Amino acid sequence: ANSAQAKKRARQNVKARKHNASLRSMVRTYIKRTLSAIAGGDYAVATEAYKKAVPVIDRMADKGIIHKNKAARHKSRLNAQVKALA
Amino acid sequence: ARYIGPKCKLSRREGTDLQLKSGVKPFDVKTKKANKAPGQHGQARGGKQSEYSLQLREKQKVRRIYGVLERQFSNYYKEAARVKGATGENLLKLLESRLDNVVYRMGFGSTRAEARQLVSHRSITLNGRRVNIASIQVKAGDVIAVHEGAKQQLRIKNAIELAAQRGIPAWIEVDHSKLEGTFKAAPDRSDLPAEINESLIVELYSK
Amino acid sequence: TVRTLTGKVVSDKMDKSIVVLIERRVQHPLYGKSIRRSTKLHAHDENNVAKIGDVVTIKESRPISKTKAWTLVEVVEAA
């Protein structure tokens, strides 16, 4: 970078990248836990995992880490897959 | 540019008086070489000429009368061809509408060259402004006058005296006491002299 | 208020899809003689109603696959 503001932008970019990566990985982990419960197949366990996962997805979507359309897609598809377990 | 040089040899080559001199003395007595070309190989007017030669020699005569060079003359022809009506009539009206020609036909200039000199030196006002362009087109109803500083000039009195001898034109209404005239309308082809065959210039440029 | 086309089915092998051949008659831009031009369109047939040789009507729709953006409306004439 040639200018001071460009250097500052690069520094802020690095810091925001680390923070966003943390939150995104949290979302992925919760979705993966829900998927693991679904694969296990117990209805109550899958329901508990889904109920745990939904608030995290919603909070990160509100913060802007993911899009709210993405959050809605995840909620709908995971709810359908849980309901399939009867 | 502008042609500067001998005037009478141009008339001799063209074969007709071109009004380049004021007119105190007749052209024949002035030149004594009329009826002959200006070259050492010059002949009489009876020599054979091609159609290209006739067309060229016709346009050169008009150009030498009006003091207009080739590029401006071509622009005049293009404007005349664009404007509806007889092309030769439009071209002649365009030539006569020039400010320097109008001053000469008013009589403040004994020659078109003198009128052009006056216009350039800002001795003439159009409407109420001191213009200095000889090629300004004069429109119907325009008023031409002499500037006060230029008034009381022996050349102007001589020019108006000579204009008194010359035929006063119909389309221009001029009072000599205060030295001011009005352009009423564009002259007609019938009003203009009939020795000019503008059709030759038309066929020259139409090729 | 939808764009429709009428043509002849030239293929029905794939699942839920037909190949319709459209024909148009146009003037040659320079020589002025009317000539024949043909275009091949992939359509969607949910129940595989159409067959080879039928005359069908198709209408423009949102994309359904890589090459399909038209859907069958009705079978005007059956082979």
Place this chain on the structure above:
Amino acid sequence: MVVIRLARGGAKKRPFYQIVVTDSRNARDGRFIERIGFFNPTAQGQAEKLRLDADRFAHWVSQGAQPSERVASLAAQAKKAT
């Protein structure tokens, strides 16, 4: 945002402005949405000095366009004249 501003035309030292509605990110003399009048600061004789279409001006202002300071002054002048 959408703005109403002057686009410079004419010749050297004799500017002639078109009043245009455009996205503010476009070039001054480039892409525009709608032309709604003109301004000629050095008009004389029979030349019209200012012309503004008040109906379209009000329509775009209600839609959310932001006039520049000069265009706002010209609109005030046109309203006073009419």
Place this chain on the structure above:
RNA sequence: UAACUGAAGAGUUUGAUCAUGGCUCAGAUUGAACGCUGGCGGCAGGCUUAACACAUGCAAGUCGAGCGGGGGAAGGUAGCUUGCUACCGGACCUAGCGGCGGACGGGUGAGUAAUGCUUAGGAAUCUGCCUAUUAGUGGGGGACAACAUCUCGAAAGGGAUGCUAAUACCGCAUACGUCCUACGGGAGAAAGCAGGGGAUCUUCGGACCUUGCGCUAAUAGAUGAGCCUAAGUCGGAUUAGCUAGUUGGUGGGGUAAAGGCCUACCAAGGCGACGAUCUGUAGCGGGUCUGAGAGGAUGAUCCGCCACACUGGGACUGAGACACGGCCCAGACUCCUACGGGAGGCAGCAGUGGGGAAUAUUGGACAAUGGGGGGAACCCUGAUCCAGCCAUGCCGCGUGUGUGAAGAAGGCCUUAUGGUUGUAAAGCACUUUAAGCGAGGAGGAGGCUACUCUAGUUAAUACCUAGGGAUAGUGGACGUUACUCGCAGAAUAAGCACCGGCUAACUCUGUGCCAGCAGCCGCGGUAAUACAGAGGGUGCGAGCGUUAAUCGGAUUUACUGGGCGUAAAGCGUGCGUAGGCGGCUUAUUAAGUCGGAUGUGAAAUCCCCGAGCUUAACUUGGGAAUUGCAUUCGAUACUGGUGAGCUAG
């Protein structure tokens, strides 16, 4: 009213001739270059070649009214070596955190024959700042730069420990809208700052009221962008077969969003002589040049779209980038080094080297129009507006005007004394354009500040917002502006090509197939109108010629608009595939064909009528035009489709 109206030929094959057929010439045009010459102004244009390599300066910042620190100037009080010292309250500045901007504006055409462009439509999307409307802005917590200490390095810059503020970050609470839903329910936000003030309290310094700028959730609008479809968009067959995520389907993934976009299975599909695949070339359009038109050539300057940023591969942040002056990786190259370690990308503006036949200043100002930040004051802006250079082009002007013959001199020619130069010159009399000197002087500046009043919102006369009035200040790079008025003096200002025919303009000397000229036919071998000089003339004129290039003439690829017995040209002859075309009558259809209506066909450009430039170039108002495309409604003679019938093929 008007928006166009438009078409020329010539030379050259032969002892003549007619035809055929090439070659050449007369025109228009240019981002031109070169040769000779060169006064001024206005308006434009200015690396077409090396997307070659780049020294140096500038081209992106702004906000203290988001935040904590840290600075250095003026004041005041107290002491006194007496004009010096110690502290204290205000006014300024900014390295750091944070917000917005940096995705615009600017450059270039390398790549790209279709993921691009043009025209016409469409559904499955997101969209900061702007406009309207609705519901809100409650209460806590843990950190990290700055700072302090240590340490490496000449530095530039690095590394390590201990603190701290916020509109930085994360929980909890609440939810008109919003998301999911199995229709039972479940889930998710935010931040403060500033101006003013009556009364009250002030746990002691603010609370409280009010008004702005903000922040959160959402729905519309506007703007911008993403996606899809149809038709059109340069050659090559001495490139004929191409394709296995390939074509389609299902489950799942993924995206803002449809979709083989991805993945696992199932099927064997998909494209191609209406040119697939491969290969050469190329940014596309509005437009520009030429042409009677149809066509042909072209894509500088202006506008729209696309693509690229030393060469390749990626992602981050963000509303928006896979980002010219941001990051990571790889490659080549270049630079500093104290050998420890570092730095870079002009196809931004100016400029340098090189290349080339050839293309300019390392300039001024943010005054105007715009763009970024800010509440404002104001700051930034090589965008822009101007200036400098160049006859590169277009338009305009000047280089003087009248008179002046028993026709001066000199030059050239001569049938030898006349002719031509020529009214040309001298002489006489006038003039002051432009350039020079001096004096005045618009407009491009709308506004802003101060003063006054009115009307809104409020508890308010304060603050803020919106208006009106008069006065005074303040604001121009260009710039000594345009323009106007005076001064002296013809005084400062003319060249270039050609004269055998095509093609306007002719002789004399010099030379003798030499020297030389030449677009074509052709000139020169002792009287050369064709070579060189001179005299004279012709054409243009601050220009004149040459070279290069496009269209034309060329009916010389012939659609408009040509030919094939002998001039070039009928396959050696049949059969036959695709294709092209096809007898008569009738009913029907409305694809071709024709007509109407509606939408669209950006602006600029061309054309017409006006307007302003002293005129013109040029600028500009309004029209006309954009011959096209799409939708829809009609007609049924002809062609096509379908049904029936017939016999001359």
